[PDB]
């Protein structure tokens, strides 16, 4: 199945205390592999999955340096933004950056990303063609015009189309053991009588990887949406994931409903039926 | 591996 690599960066001003808090993480699909935290002791990019630990000293020195420069750029960015939005030095503000790339099952390039938020709203993003920009509003138009003149996209594109995917390739290869495993979900169904007249049927999907999953309800073999709760996929905390789906059903009708699970780890999708 | 060049806004 397909794969990605994404870095996420976050800075948060804190006028009165020191410099902005800067937090950066890198992921390959759903596995975080590097982190940097301006507030931590070591002042270094640190490993977070066994397979990146293989990289030699020059990697760590280099990545530390590059992540530092990201942070220092965000530092300037906070200010320039404060300015464009005539905001006072008093308030705390947040910049957020994310970029990276997707490849298909053949590891050939598929899509590139680069985007930028100010105080929790878009600000500027590189369109899907990696050749033009979307400015979220009028202030961002100043950036877009700057970055157009500066041929910024051209550089971004070469990275995303090339360097990004080559490194993703390397990572996947080196991380074969873990990253291209697929963990089928362990599935079961629970039943709780909500009253004399109703009962909840909850369909569980535990310990799976990747995080991409679909749980759907059916009644008499037709897609069932009404009276359905479905929660956000959540990390188990040991590298795998959980989700659940529930329907409330009239008591005595439990046999009509079936739960359907699809996940790349499963040769054919599962159907579960309350199993009295 | 991180981008080396980050353009300011």
């Amino acid at each position: 199945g397909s794969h990605s690599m994404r870095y996420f960066f976050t800075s948060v001003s804190r006028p009165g205390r020191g410099e902005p808090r800067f937090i950066a993480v890198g992921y390959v699909d759903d596995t975080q592999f590097v982190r940097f935290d301006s507030d931590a002791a070591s002042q270094r990019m640190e490993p977070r999955a066994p397979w990146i630990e293989q990289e030699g000293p020059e990697y760590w020195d280099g990545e530390t340096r590059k992540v530092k420069a990201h942070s220092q750029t965000h530092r300037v960015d906070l200010g320039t933004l404060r300015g464009y939005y005539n905001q006072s030095e008093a308030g705390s503000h947040t910049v957020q950056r994310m970029y990276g790339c997707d490849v298909g099952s053949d590891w050939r390039f598929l899509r590139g990303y680069h985007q930028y938020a100010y105080d929790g709203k878009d600000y500027i993003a590189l369109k899907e063609d990696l050749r033009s920009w979307t400015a979220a509003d009028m202030a961002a138009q100043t950036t877009k015009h700057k970055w157009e003149a500066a041929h910024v996209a051209e550089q971004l594109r070469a990275y995303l189309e090339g360097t990004c995917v080559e490194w993703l390739r390397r990572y996947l290869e080196n991380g074969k053991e873990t990253l291209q495993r697929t963990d089928a979900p362990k599935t079961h169904m629970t039943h709780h009588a909500v009253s004399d007249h109703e009962a909840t049927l909850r369909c569980w999907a535990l310990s799976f990887y990747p995080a991409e999953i679909t749980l759907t309800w059916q009644r008499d073999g037709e897609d069932q949406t009404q009276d359905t709760e479905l929660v956000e996929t959540r990390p188990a905390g040991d590298g795998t994931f959980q989700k659940w789906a529930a329907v409330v059903v009239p008591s005595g009708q439990e046999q009509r409903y079936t739960c359907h699970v699809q996940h790349e780890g499963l040769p054919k999708p599962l159907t579960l039926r309350w199993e009295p | 591996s991180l981008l080396m060049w980050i353009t300011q806004v």
């Epitope: 020059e58 990697y59 020195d61 280099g62 340096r65 590059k66 420069a69 220092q72 750029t73 530092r75 300037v76 200010g79 500066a150 910024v152 550089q155 070469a158 990275y159 360097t163 990004c164 490194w167 | 591996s1 991180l2 981008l3 080396m4 060049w5 980050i6 353009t7 300011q8």
Partner: antibody, heavy 119, light 110 residues
Framework: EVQLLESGGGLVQPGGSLRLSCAAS????????MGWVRQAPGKGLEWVSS????????AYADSVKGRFTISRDNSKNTLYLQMNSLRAEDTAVYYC????????????WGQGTTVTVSS | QSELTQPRSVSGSPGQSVTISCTGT?????????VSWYQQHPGKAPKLIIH???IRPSGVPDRFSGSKSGNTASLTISGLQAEDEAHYYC?????????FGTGTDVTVLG
Amino acid sequence: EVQLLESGGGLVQPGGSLRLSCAASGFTFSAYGMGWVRQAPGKGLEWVSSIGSSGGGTAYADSVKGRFTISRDNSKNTLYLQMNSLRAEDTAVYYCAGELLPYYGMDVWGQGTTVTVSS
Amino acid sequence: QSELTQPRSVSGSPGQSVTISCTGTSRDVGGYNYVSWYQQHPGKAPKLIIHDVIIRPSGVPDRFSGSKSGNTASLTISGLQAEDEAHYYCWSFAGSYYVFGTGTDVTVLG
């Protein structure tokens, strides 16, 4: 016995192409950001373009935006600079140079090569 | 793009100190701690003498030092010597490009 050795540069007409090569030896080439810095006679150091590592690279000076293209082939320890639509402005010694790590600056230089753009 | 900015030329006597300012904006030299200085002797390639504002590469002599304070970076040479007469260039990261300074001319008086 570090050595960057510039080639592929002579005289070229205005609007011409030229493509410079830089054979590199005695340092681990794939650890180094690679770059070009040029120096017109009488005048000061410029900075044309740089490529990184690893991830990172490429970037170009505003005076060469989209005329120039940097590239690297480690399986060959060689660095490339495609130079098209050359104006007289571009007349200089071009130096091949490395950085030991990101943002370090150029700590390994070539001897330089000469590019004259003229009719 | 643009600039850096150093005095056209600074001079001094043997044994003396000399300083070469190099000034930019909050956006390059004021933006980051990545300034480096180079030395270039007549018809010879540049050589790196400072990096990361303050560090000297293993190799270079003890009487060279870098510093920076706001948007100006400085290079002090102390105990000046004949073979120090040369051109010096600062140079800084600026996020999306590198930019050399306009270069200075160090002389040794008398």
